Amino acid sequence: VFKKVLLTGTSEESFTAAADDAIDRAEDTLDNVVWAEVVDQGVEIGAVEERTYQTEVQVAFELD
Amino acid sequence: VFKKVLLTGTSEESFTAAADDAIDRAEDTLDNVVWAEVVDQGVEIGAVEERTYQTEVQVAFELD
Amino acid sequence: VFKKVLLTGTSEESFTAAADDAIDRAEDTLDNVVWAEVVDQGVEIGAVEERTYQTEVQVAFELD
Amino acid sequence: VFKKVLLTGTSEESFTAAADDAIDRAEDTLDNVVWAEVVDQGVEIGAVEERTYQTEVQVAFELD
Amino acid sequence: VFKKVLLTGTSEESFTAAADDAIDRAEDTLDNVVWAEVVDQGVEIGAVEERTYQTEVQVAFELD
Amino acid sequence: VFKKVLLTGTSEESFTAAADDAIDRAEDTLDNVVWAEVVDQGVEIGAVEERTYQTEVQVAFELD
Amino acid sequence: VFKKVLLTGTSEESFTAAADDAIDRAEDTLDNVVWAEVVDQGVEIGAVEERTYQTEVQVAFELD
Amino acid sequence: VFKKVLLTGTSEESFTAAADDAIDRAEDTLDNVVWAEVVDQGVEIGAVEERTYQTEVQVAFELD
Amino acid sequence: VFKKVLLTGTSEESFTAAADDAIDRAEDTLDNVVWAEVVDQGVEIGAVEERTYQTEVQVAFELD
Amino acid sequence: VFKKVLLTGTSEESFTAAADDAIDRAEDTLDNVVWAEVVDQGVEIGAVEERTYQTEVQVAFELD
Amino acid sequence: VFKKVLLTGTSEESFTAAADDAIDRAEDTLDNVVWAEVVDQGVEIGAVEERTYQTEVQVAFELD
Amino acid sequence: VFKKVLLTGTSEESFTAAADDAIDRAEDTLDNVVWAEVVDQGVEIGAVEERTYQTEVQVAFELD
Ligand SMILES: Cc1cc2nc3c(=O)[nH]c(=O)nc-3n(C[C@H](O)[C@H](O)[C@H](O)CO)c2cc1C
Ligand SMILES: Cc1cc2nc3c(=O)[nH]c(=O)nc-3n(C[C@H](O)[C@H](O)[C@H](O)CO)c2cc1C
Ligand SMILES: Cc1cc2nc3c(=O)[nH]c(=O)nc-3n(C[C@H](O)[C@H](O)[C@H](O)CO)c2cc1C
Ligand SMILES: Cc1cc2nc3c(=O)[nH]c(=O)nc-3n(C[C@H](O)[C@H](O)[C@H](O)CO)c2cc1C
Ligand SMILES: Cc1cc2nc3c(=O)[nH]c(=O)nc-3n(C[C@H](O)[C@H](O)[C@H](O)CO)c2cc1C
Ligand SMILES: Cc1cc2nc3c(=O)[nH]c(=O)nc-3n(C[C@H](O)[C@H](O)[C@H](O)CO)c2cc1C
Ligand SMILES: Cc1cc2nc3c(=O)[nH]c(=O)nc-3n(C[C@H](O)[C@H](O)[C@H](O)CO)c2cc1C
Ligand SMILES: Cc1cc2nc3c(=O)[nH]c(=O)nc-3n(C[C@H](O)[C@H](O)[C@H](O)CO)c2cc1C
Ligand SMILES: Cc1cc2nc3c(=O)[nH]c(=O)nc-3n(C[C@H](O)[C@H](O)[C@H](O)CO)c2cc1C
Ligand SMILES: Cc1cc2nc3c(=O)[nH]c(=O)nc-3n(C[C@H](O)[C@H](O)[C@H](O)CO)c2cc1C
Ligand SMILES: Cc1cc2nc3c(=O)[nH]c(=O)nc-3n(C[C@H](O)[C@H](O)[C@H](O)CO)c2cc1C
Ligand SMILES: Cc1cc2nc3c(=O)[nH]c(=O)nc-3n(C[C@H](O)[C@H](O)[C@H](O)CO)c2cc1C
Ligand SMILES: [Cl-]
Ligand SMILES: [Cl-]
Ligand SMILES: [Cl-]
Ligand SMILES: [Cl-]
Ligand SMILES: [Mg+2]
Ligand SMILES: [Mg+2]
Ligand SMILES: [Mg+2]
Ligand SMILES: [Mg+2]
Ligand SMILES: [Mg+2]
Ligand SMILES: [Mg+2]
Ligand SMILES: [Mg+2]
Ligand SMILES: [Mg+2]
Ligand SMILES: [Mg+2]
Ligand SMILES: [Mg+2]
Ligand SMILES: [Mg+2]
Ligand SMILES: [Mg+2]
Ligand SMILES: [Mg+2]
Ligand SMILES: [Mg+2]
Ligand SMILES: [Mg+2]
Ligand SMILES: [Mg+2]
Ligand SMILES: [Mg+2]
Ligand SMILES: [Mg+2]
Ligand SMILES: [Mg+2]
Ligand SMILES: [Mg+2]
Ligand SMILES: [Mg+2]
Ligand SMILES: [Mg+2]
Ligand SMILES: [Mg+2]
Ligand SMILES: [Mg+2]
Ligand code: NA
Ligand code: NA
Ligand code: NA
Ligand code: NA
């Protein structure tokens, strides 16, 4: 059985790095992270010093 | 990093109040709730005394 | 077996009340109305005296 | 010919009132506003004093 | 309030049995599982001995 | 001209049999049922003795 | 209150004429047909003498 | 950079001609119109003398 | 078993004729073309002498 | 690099077996079939002796 | 009230840089640009010297 | 007439480079590749040495 958690990563560099940011967080607290599916991307502009890229992923991990 | 939990709030009054019901629950058990996105709305009719409005939200909260 | 009918309710007050308007109509002519799913919302503005909120629902009822 | 503008209204009270907020703004600056279609709803929580309901609408107006 | 968890069940027999596999897992660790919604189905072919059917479900459970 | 009715079939056995349940019902009351399109699947769990599979279909029938 | 019926019109000439075919049928049996929304288009090729264009519409009519 | 405007054209003749109606309007007031994407089609029936076909397009134009 | 190929037809006349253009091409090189499903429509404007209507279809053909 | 082909399998027994029918066909003519994603399901009723279940899959295979 | 404009940025380097290209343009002519949502990505290949990445964004800005 | 093939490119570096990987493959075996549309992105994590970014594209090429 796989379970997914819906995480939004951020990065001041790129959409790819914002995906990695979410995946890094999942791997910090979850065992057996197997894949991620991009479900949304955006950019925070007027509440941040630099533009922040965001990539939202469903991060899948195998249960047990 | 933001994480979302997928909650359905209920209310006998309105769709807005059913959204608040889910958000209240998230704020009970989660720190740093930042926003909610409506993903579905419905009404329970024939298993309840009064019509119950339901609003399903992805409730986003900042990790750490 | 459940069947759905696709109804748009209207109200000069709110989206919730426009949903109720469609559900009321379904309950007038159908037995065993069990639930409704919101599929669209809109507002009629320039052909009405007051803004009219509209909520379109799939209203489910149990057959037999 | 109709044209649509994509507006997000806000309200501290309800999703219906947040729709009205966007429609009010369209009627301030546009002639012949005829209808609005709800395309999204959400709630701002952790950057506001009170929860703020948001309703995003495509507001249609007749050209000429 | 209902909460959903996004689980992918697997089975070497059928899509229905892969749904049951996810639901079984939810019932192992969650109280008050009330319903599941199918959101995706697939088949793993070239990394398994036998084809494995997969059914991804949002499994809803009542909070409290 | 074809018309569709939106029916949810149920079964304690499988998604396929729940589709048949809706189609059987359509064929009971309609002439010239030609095809069905699956639009949703789910499982009722916590209000039934046994899990009940549900398959929602648009059942198409030729008018005249 | 508006209700919609989901009809597929056919024509050997065009998608527009296939829409009219469904609308004609609705106007034959329904009072107060107000609008139609195109939801799908297709072409039947290998079971017909000539290609047949099909346009599927939700045909809306005002109740009462 | 391209920008899109969301226009609904109308015609008493066809969906193609309703698309042209929106595109004509865009070309009246915009320079460098490059393409259009159909996003919706419908028919106005019960508020017009003759059925009116409508085609909604995102009309893209190159900025500068 | 049916297979689909994803083709975009073009025409200087209409969306229907652009669908036929793709279907003609499929029938040139494929046996047993049975149906087509419209998946997108658009208009090329600023790189062509005359506006070109485009209709994208999944063209289904029976294998064997 | 993976490539997908869009196949509809059929079966007089079940949706799972109709998926297998498409996958079998892909494995007949393609090397390195790795997975399939269900994209649609339906039932042919009024042109067949027995109801025929259909499952449409994107069948993925590794190139080279 | 927020308003969105639908812009496609281009870049010969990356999808992230194509998003920035659209956002830069919005910030050139609009005050209070607050966020952008990615709605599509593509690559222009056979009408350009080098591949051009494109990222289409809804760019949101606060009115007033 | 344009035809599309549905390819998933991979890269250990970025989503943009994974798109290029699919496009490179299409240009290896196809003449007149004109554009690509991103339809999905993901990351393979727990079956690879390094995270692998994947970008799925519909790659369009002109027939003849
Ligand atoms: C993808 C994305 C979507 C956003 N959507 C909203 C929104 O709908 N409403 C909103 O108030 N702020 C939104 N924001 C945040 C906005 O940019 C700003 O930080 C907040 O408005 C401050 O309260 C969004 C930010 C991002 C990156
Ligand atoms: C939005 C919504 C969707 C529902 N969908 C279903 C359904 O698909 N099948 C079902 O058995 N009950 C459904 N119900 C519950 C139904 O109204 C009733 O309470 C149950 O059927 C009792 O078992 C739904 C209720 C709501 C509010
Ligand atoms: C949600 C919604 C969508 C509508 N869409 C259309 C449309 O696409 N075309 C149209 O002519 N009128 C549309 N109208 C009606 C419009 O506001 C006006 O009453 C009619 O144009 C009068 O013929 C719509 C109204 C609502 C509430
Ligand atoms: C519907 C909605 C969606 C939002 N989405 C985002 C988002 O994707 N990323 C983000 O940083 N903030 C988002 N926000 C804003 C967030 O709540 C907060 O105000 C900002 O993060 C401050 O920078 C959103 C707000 C709303 C109301
Ligand atoms: C529904 C489904 C979707 C999949 N999608 C992907 C994918 O996008 N990329 C991938 O590398 N593997 C995918 N796989 C796994 C693939 O079949 C194989 O096991 C892995 O490629 C091994 O690394 C998928 C498997 C299933 C069942
Ligand atoms: C596919 C599916 C969806 C459902 N969705 C809802 C829902 O949104 N809200 C709800 O109260 N019950 C829902 N139910 C019914 C739920 O399981 C239970 O029977 C009712 O909550 C009893 O009132 C659903 C059941 C099914 C099978
Ligand atoms: C838009 C459209 C979709 C169709 N889809 C299917 C299908 O999924 N399966 C099928 O057997 N026939 C389908 N057909 C019918 C097919 O062309 C042929 O008439 C039947 O296969 C005969 O049994 C479709 C026809 C049209 C116009
Ligand atoms: C595509 C389309 C959608 C429409 N949707 C609506 C609607 O949701 N509600 C409505 O009142 N009128 C709608 N209308 C307008 C309706 O036909 C009639 O002109 C108005 O109801 C008059 O107020 C629509 C018209 C078209 C062409
Ligand atoms: C439906 C449609 C969509 C198009 N989308 C794009 C696009 O996203 N980017 C682009 O550069 N050109 C696009 N074009 C082509 C554009 O009109 C023009 O021919 C090219 O920009 C020349 O390089 C599109 C054309 C059509 C018909
Ligand atoms: C999923 C599915 C969808 C279909 N859609 C259509 C359709 O849109 N139009 C049609 O003529 N036949 C359709 N058919 C075929 C229909 O049942 C019948 O075999 C044909 O109408 C014979 O020409 C479909 C069949 C299936 C299984
Ligand atoms: C995302 C994207 C989508 C496009 N879609 C189309 C299309 O549907 N039809 C078309 O003629 N050109 C399209 N083009 C443009 C195509 O690559 C080429 O520049 C034009 O065909 C020249 O007229 C598209 C380009 C991009 C980047
Ligand atoms: C976007 C993406 C989606 C995937 N989906 C699935 C899936 O649904 N089921 C699965 O078994 N593996 C999936 N995988 C593959 C998974 O990560 C792992 O390699 C396989 O499970 C090994 O059999 C996917 C991989 C990617 C990159
Ligand atoms: Cl989710
Ligand atoms: Cl828009
Ligand atoms: Cl329907
Ligand atoms: Cl495809
Ligand atoms: Mg930096
Ligand atoms: Mg988002
Ligand atoms: Mg009360
Ligand atoms: Mg729901
Ligand atoms: Mg009042
Ligand atoms: Mg509507
Ligand atoms: Mg107040
Ligand atoms: Mg939003
Ligand atoms: Mg076995
Ligand atoms: Mg999946
Ligand atoms: Mg049994
Ligand atoms: Mg459902
Ligand atoms: Mg003729
Ligand atoms: Mg169809
Ligand atoms: Mg005329
Ligand atoms: Mg519309
Ligand atoms: Mg001509
Ligand atoms: Mg297109
Ligand atoms: Mg048998
Ligand atoms: Mg289908
Ligand atoms: Mg360079
Ligand atoms: Mg695009
Ligand atoms: Mg490297
Ligand atoms: Mg994918
Ligand atoms: Na989730
Ligand atoms: Na219906
Ligand atoms: Na817009
Ligand atoms: Na394809």
TrEMBL record, chains A, B, C, D, E, F, G, H, I, J, K, L:
Record: residues binding FAD 1: E37, E44, Q54
Superkingdom of source: Archaea
Binding-site residues, Mg(2+) 1: E13
Residues engaged in binding Mg(2+) 4: D40, E56
Residues the entry annotates as binding Mg(2+) 3: D40
Entry binding sites for riboflavin: W35, E44, Q54
Keyword tags: FAD, Flavoprotein, Metal-binding, Nucleotide-binding
Any one Gene Ontology molecular-function term assigned to this protein's record: metal ion binding
Positions bound to FAD 3: E44, Q54
Binding of FAD 2, residues: E44, Q54
Positions contributing to Mg(2+) 2 binding: E13, E50
Name assigned to this protein: Dodecin
Organism for this UniProt entry: Halobacterium salinarum (strain ATCC 700922 / JCM 11081 / NRC-1) (Halobacterium halobium)
